[PDB]
Amino acid sequence: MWFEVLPGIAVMGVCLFIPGMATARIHRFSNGGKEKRVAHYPYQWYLMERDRRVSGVNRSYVSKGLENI
Amino acid sequence: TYKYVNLREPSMDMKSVTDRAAQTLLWTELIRGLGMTLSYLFREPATINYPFEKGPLSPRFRGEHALRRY
Amino acid sequence: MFMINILMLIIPILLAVAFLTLVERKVLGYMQLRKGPNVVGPYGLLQPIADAIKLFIKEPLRPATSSASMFILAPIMALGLALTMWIPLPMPYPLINMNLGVLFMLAMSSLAVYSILWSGWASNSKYALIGALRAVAQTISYEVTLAIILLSVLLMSGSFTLSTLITTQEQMWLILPAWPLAMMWFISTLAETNRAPFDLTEGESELYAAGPFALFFMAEYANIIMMNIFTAILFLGTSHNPHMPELYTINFTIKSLLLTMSFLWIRASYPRFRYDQLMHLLWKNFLPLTLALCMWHVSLPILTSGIPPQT
Amino acid sequence: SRGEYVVAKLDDLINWARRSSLWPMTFGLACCAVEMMHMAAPRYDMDRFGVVFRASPRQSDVMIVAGTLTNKMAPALRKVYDQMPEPRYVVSMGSCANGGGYYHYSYSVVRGCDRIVPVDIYVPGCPPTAEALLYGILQLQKKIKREKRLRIWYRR
Amino acid sequence: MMLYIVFILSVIFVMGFVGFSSKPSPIYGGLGLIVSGGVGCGIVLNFGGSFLGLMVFLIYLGGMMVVFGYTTAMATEQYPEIWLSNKAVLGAFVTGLLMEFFMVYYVLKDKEVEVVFEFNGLGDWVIYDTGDSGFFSEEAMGIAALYSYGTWLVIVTGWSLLIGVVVIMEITRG
Amino acid sequence: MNLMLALLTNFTLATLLVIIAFWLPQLNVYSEKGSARLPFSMKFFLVAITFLLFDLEIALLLPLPWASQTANLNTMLTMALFLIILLAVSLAYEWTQKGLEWTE
Amino acid sequence: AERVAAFLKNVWAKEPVLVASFAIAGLAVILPTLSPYTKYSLMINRATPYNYPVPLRDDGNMPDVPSHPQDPQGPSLEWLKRL
Numbered sequence: 001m002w003f004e005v006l007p008g009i010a011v012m013g014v015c016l017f018i019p020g021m022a023t024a025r026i027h028r029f030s031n032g033g034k035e036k037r038v039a040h041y042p043y044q045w046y047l048m049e050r051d052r053r054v055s056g057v058n059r060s061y062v063s064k065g066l067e068n069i
Numbered sequence: 070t071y072k073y074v075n076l077r078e079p080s081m082d083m084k085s086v087t088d089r090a091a092q093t094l095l096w097t098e099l100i101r102g103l104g105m106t107l108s109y110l111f112r113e114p115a116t117i118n119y120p121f122e123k124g125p126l127s128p129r130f131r132g133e134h135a136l137r138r139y
Numbered sequence: 140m141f142m143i144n145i146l147m148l149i150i151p152i153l154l155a156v157a158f159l160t161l162v163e164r165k166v167l168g169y170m171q172l173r174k175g176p177n178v179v180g181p182y183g184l185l186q187p188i189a190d191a192i193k194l195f196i197k198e199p200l201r202p203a204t205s206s207a208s209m210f211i212l213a214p215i216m217a218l219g220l221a222l223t224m225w226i227p228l229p230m231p232y233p234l235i236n237m238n239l240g241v242l243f244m245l246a247m248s249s250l251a252v253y254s255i256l257w258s259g260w261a262s263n264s265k266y267a268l269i270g271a272l273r274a275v276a277q278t279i280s281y282e283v284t285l286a287i288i289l290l291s292v293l294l295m296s297g298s299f300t301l302s303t304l305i306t307t308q309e310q311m312w313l314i315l316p317a318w319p320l321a322m323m324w325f326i327s328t329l330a331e332t333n334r335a336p337f338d339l340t341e342g343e344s345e346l347y348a349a350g351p352f353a354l355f356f357m358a359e360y361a362n363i364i365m366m367n368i369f370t371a372i373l374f375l376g377t378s379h380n381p382h383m384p385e386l387y388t389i390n391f392t393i394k395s396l397l398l399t400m401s402f403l404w405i406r407a408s409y410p411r412f413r414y415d416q417l418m419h420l421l422w423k424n425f426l427p428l429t430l431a432l433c434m435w436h437v438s439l440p441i442l443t444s445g446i447p448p449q450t
Numbered sequence: 451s452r453g454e455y456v457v458a459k460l461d462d463l464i465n466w467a468r469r470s471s472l473w474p475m476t477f478g479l480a481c482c483a484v485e486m487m488h489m490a491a492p493r494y495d496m497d498r499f500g501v502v503f504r505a506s507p508r509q510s511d512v513m514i515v516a517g518t519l520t521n522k523m524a525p526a527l528r529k530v531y532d533q534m535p536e537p538r539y540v541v542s543m544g545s546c547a548n549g550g551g552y553y554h555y556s557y558s559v560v561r562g563c564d565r566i567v568p569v570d571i572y573v574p575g576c577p578p579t580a581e582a583l584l585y586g587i588l589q590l591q592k593k594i595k596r597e598k599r600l601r602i603w604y605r606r
Numbered sequence: 607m608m609l610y611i612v613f614i615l616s617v618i619f620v621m622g623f624v625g626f627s628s629k630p631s632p633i634y635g636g637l638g639l640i641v642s643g644g645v646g647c648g649i650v651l652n653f654g655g656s657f658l659g660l661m662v663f664l665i666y667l668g669g670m671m672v673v674f675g676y677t678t679a680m681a682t683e684q685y686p687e688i689w690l691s692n693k694a695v696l697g698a699f700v701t702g703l704l705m706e707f708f709m710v711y712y713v714l715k716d717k718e719v720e721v722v723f724e725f726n727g728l729g730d731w732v733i734y735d736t737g738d739s740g741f742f743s744e745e746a747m748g749i750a751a752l753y754s755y756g757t758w759l760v761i762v763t764g765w766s767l768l769i770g771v772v773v774i775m776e777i778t779r780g
Numbered sequence: 781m782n783l784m785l786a787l788l789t790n791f792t793l794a795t796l797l798v799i800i801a802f803w804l805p806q807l808n809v810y811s812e813k814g815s816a817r818l819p820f821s822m823k824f825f826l827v828a829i830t831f832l833l834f835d836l837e838i839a840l841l842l843p844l845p846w847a848s849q850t851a852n853l854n855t856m857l858t859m860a861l862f863l864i865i866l867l868a869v870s871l872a873y874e875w876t877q878k879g880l881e882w883t884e
Numbered sequence: 885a886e887r888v889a890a891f892l893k894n895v896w897a898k899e900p901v902l903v904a905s906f907a908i909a910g911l912a913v914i915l916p917t918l919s920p921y922t923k924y925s926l927m928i929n930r931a932t933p934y935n936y937p938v939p940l941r942d943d944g945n946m947p948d949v950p951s952h953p954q955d956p957q958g959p960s961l962e963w964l965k966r967l
């Protein structure tokens with residue numbers, strides 16, 4: 001019956017699901033639990049480089065707040 | 070006695086011409102063809118599970134020869 | 140950590156291609172009142188594995204080619220480029236976040252025609268070379284409309300970044316303002332991927348083997364999936380919740396799966412175009428409309444005051 | 451030993467793959483081709499066994515000779531056999547292909563396709579039923595299951 | 607070092623040119639140009655020209671070079687001659703590589719060389735700009751200006767392309 | 781660096797699959813079993829050349845999403861339509877001159 | 885008026901694809917001149933501040949130049965908030 005086509009579809013679907021899921025969780029793991037910073041333009045890159053120096057550990061994703069004021 | 074398979078004049082009024090333009094541009098007859106293959110997907114197939122199931126035969130079936138006894 | 144990410148894209152792509160061969164056969168079967176593979180593994184789930192192993196241990200019968208380098212080059216180019224097409228795709232986050240991602244996909248896809256051309260040269264047979272040139276002519280012809288249709292859509296998105304298509308469709312799928320382009324885009328991808336009713340390479344030769352045959356097949360089916368993932372993003376934008384990116388990945392995968400199944404659905408439903416007829420479908424039908432809709436989509440945001448932002 | 455054991459399992463694996471993915475090139479010469487079509491038709495659905503409906507000669511593993519092989523046709527059939535990549539098997543289907551059948555005494559007919567190519571399975575009948583042909587394909591699968599290519603390789 | 611990426615790409619750029627300029631079979635000559643085009647795009651990419659880099663790929667390689675290969679397969683070479691089989695091609699190919707290697711070796715040893723004219727060898731990064739923090743691509747701004755500033759350029763460019771269509775139909779009708 | 785690694789991985793894997801696809805155990809011990817006018821229509825040349833010219837026009841339309849951000853919209857819209865109209869005139873010329881026909 | 889109407893009906897019956905193309909291309913050329921919203925596209929494009937607004941040295945006779953961004957002088961984007 002038609003629903004016996006579903007197992008092949010499910011395997012296909014899980015295979016297509018892994019790329020997107022893996023990238024999202026790898027980004028969080030490598031960026032301190034946040035979204036990976038997007039820098040398409042020089043201004044965004046400039047702020048990301050400034051964050052790296054401000055962090056004190058050379059990690060642009062390590063944020064400093066009022067505790068540094 | 071005979072019949073014509075393909076002897077018809079299309080209606081040239083605006084409603085009919087616009088019907089054929091919509092068919093040309095919106096692919097309606099092609100979408101209708103998709104409907105028929107969709108209905109077959111949801112029909113039970115005709116396949117039998119050979120060799121666990123066998124096609125039906127009759128007593129007259131002509132197969133392998135044999136020599137008989139009294 | 141980034142190499143892990145690359146592998147977690149490549150390997151699932153190849154596995155999804157393998158099991159699309161199973162799904163295509165079973166979907167086609169049930170539309171043909173039969174079953175398709177259901178013996179090799181439960182519900183045919185081992186059929187792709189048996190086929191893959193069989194092909195690779197098959198004798199690699201390659202006739203003395205007129206160019207050894209171009210015989211090897213064609214499958215490497217085809218498969219290498221096919222996998223490259225996936226690296227900017229936002230699902231919802233791309234592996235490589237390109238500012239001009241849409242343009243990168245257009246440029247890489249335009250190179251895929253070299254594998255057709257080189258494989259024609261390497262065949263060492265004027266008949267296969269002529270078959271290659273007919274396929275190249277079909278492919279470049281439909282590249283014209285794909286590029287113009289894509290440009291028309293981006294005039295509502297505002298940029299070449301692929302993830303900006305997600306933002307553009309936060310309230311509404313782009314298929315609503317642009318269903319005329321979605322129609323021609325969809326048919327163009329069929330003709331681009333030499334899919335029926337545009338599968339004239341297969342039909343005309345009717346009227347490669349083993350692993351090297353398998354590699355061209357893998358590249359073809361990777362492209363088919365990628366084209367339908369692109370269509371879903373371009374016209375059926377999924378909403379992205381930054382705190383639950385996996386809800387995007389589930390919904391977007393379902394749309395891509397369904398679009399890919401519609402490729403199999405169409406293959407089951409229609410006869411094949413003649414070569415001159417699919418050339419007329421492009422040059423005398425799609426292109427006039429695409430040009431007119433390109434003019435319209437330049438004017439529309441200006442006249443409605445709906446110009447999207449650049450950033 | 452394990453070395454023999456590893457060979458035994460690898461032979462099973464390659465045999466399983468090859469018999470599970472039998473791609474036929476069908477030489478539809480005459481009426482026997484019709485029953486071959488009914489085997490691909492929905493009731494028997496040979497595709498469900500992993501036997502794709504129509505493969506190209508260069509992607510084929512089994513040639514099915516389905517009909518009368520005339521003298522005029524014999525060279526062409528042998529040419530297609532020689533172009534098949536290995537491993538390659540031949541199924542002779544029907545009396546004509548088996549041994550000439552009804553036309554055995556004709557001036558223009560090859561008396562059995564096994565005069566032109568080696569044959570693995572002979573399917574009797576005029577024509578064999580679609581089910582009889584399917585029985586023959588399944589018999590070929592069992593023949594492939596018995597192959598011990600790697601076992602013989604390592605005893606060389 | 608990755609500090610010399612632009613220089614390294616330009617070394618491959620030249621090798622691709624010595625490849626097709628020695629003029630082997632037009633099939634292999636086309637391959638050398640395709641490789642040079644891709645390497646040339648990488649050089650443009652590393653100077654901040656993303657769009658210009660992708661135009662080389664999209665238009666030069668996917669457009670013009672495809673039509674070159676297409677035409678070659680039709681009206682020139684259908685089966686390549688063995689590469690470097692002809693002595694003249696091999697001599698020219700070797701000579702260009704020998705010249706190139708000497709330039710590379712000398713500019714790397716002294717971090718400068720005088721091949722006719724005098725060049726610096728410190729690396730191309732030294733001339734780069736040091737103050738960018740705008741919220742847009744400047745290359746994109748310039749190219750987009752074709753439609754505001756370049757009305758005259760659009761008119762003559764569009765006219766030439768139309769005439770190219772008319773002209774090529776006249777040439778080929780025969 | 782990431783894009784280079786992705787490209788290197790994609791084509792390196794493609795290369796590995798291709799070579800192994802060619803060199804696998806075979807278990808056999810016996811001997812194994814030009815630059816002219818190809819007969820191809822001028823019509824196929826004209827398709828490729830027609831594609832090229834349209835592709836060059838497309839290169840000029842690609843900046844349109846950025847051009848629409850200009851304050852000189854009057855000029856920009858006029859020039860966009862001019863270019864596309866000229867592209868349409870090109871197609872109309874090939875069409876009416878039987879350049880799109882496949883007979884003869 | 886009628887001979888043109890008899891012309892349109894013929895092309896609509898014979899070449900609906902071309903009739904649609906020409907119809908859409910005409911609307912793309914005509915509608916921008918008729919639309920009342922076209923004027924806003926110019927204003928919105930000019931209201932987007934891509935670069936820094938360099939302040940003017942105050943010479944004592946610029947009553948239309950605000951001293952503070954939150955003063956009431958200078959261009960207002962109230963029209964844009966409603967739009």
Ligand SMILES: CCCCCCCCCCCCCCCCCC(=O)OC[C@H](COP(=O)(O)OCCN)OC(=O)CCCCCCCCCCCCCCCCC
Nearest residue numbers: 093094096099319321322323325326405424425901904908
């Ligand atoms: C207010 C201002 C608004 C201005 C804009 C208004 C625009 C809207 C009105 C215009 C509508 C445009 C329609 C666009 C679709 C393309 C139309 C088209 O090209 O159809 C004609 C084409 C050829 O037609 P033919 O019968 O051969 O005759 C013509 C030659 N004499 O026929 C074909 O192309 C047939 C297709 C062949 C392929 C068959 C396989 C596909 C069938 C299933 C498709 C399913 C639908 C696709 C949906 C995709 C979703 C992503």
Ligand SMILES: CCCCCCCCCCCCO[C@@H]1O[C@H](CO)[C@@H](O[C@H]2O[C@H](CO)[C@@H](O)[C@H](O)[C@H]2O)[C@H](O)[C@H]1O
Nearest residue numbers: 191192195196197198199464536537599805806807808
């Ligand atoms: C995807 C990973 C799968 C891993 C499986 C590893 C298994 C390794 C064992 C390979 C066994 C291959 O088995 C062998 O394949 C080759 C294919 O060219 C066949 O063909 C070979 O032998 C025949 C004669 O026998 C020759 O005429 C032919 O030219 C030669 O290619 C052999 O008839 C078959 O015995």
Ligand SMILES: CCCCCCCCCCCCO[C@@H]1O[C@H](CO)[C@@H](O[C@H]2O[C@H](CO)[C@@H](O)[C@H](O)[C@H]2O)[C@H](O)[C@H]1O
Nearest residue numbers: 865866868869872875876877906907908909910911913
């Ligand atoms: C509303 C304006 C919108 C802007 C449109 C953009 C510009 C497009 C320019 C396309 C010009 C095409 O012009 C086209 O020329 C040919 C002349 O042979 C005409 O077609 C004519 O020749 C054909 C044969 O080819 C005859 O079958 C047909 O009976 C006859 O009409 C078309 O009727 C006309 O449409």
Ligand SMILES: CCCCCCCCCCCCO[C@@H]1O[C@H](CO)[C@@H](O[C@H]2O[C@H](CO)[C@@H](O)[C@H](O)[C@H]2O)[C@H](O)[C@H]1O
Nearest residue numbers: 853854857858861862865866913916917918922923926
């Ligand atoms: C073969 C040659 C083809 C050439 C095709 C050229 C077609 C050009 C058609 C559109 C030209 C005018 O298009 C549109 O018209 C209106 C006039 O109401 C202009 O004016 C409108 O926008 C401006 C902004 O600059 C506003 O200040 C103005 O209040 C508003 O009316 C628009 O700036 C212009 O975008």
Ligand SMILES: N=C(N)NC(=N)NCCc1ccc(I)c(Cl)c1
Nearest residue numbers: 157160163164187190191353356
């Ligand atoms: N067109 C179909 N769907 N059937 C079909 N002939 N498939 C081809 C089988 C195949 C090819 C490559 C690989 I890798 C795998 Cl795993 C399977």
Ligand code: SF4
Nearest residue numbers: 481482544545546577
């Ligand atoms: S064996 Fe019988 S059915 Fe088959 S081809 Fe010969 S006559 Fe026809």
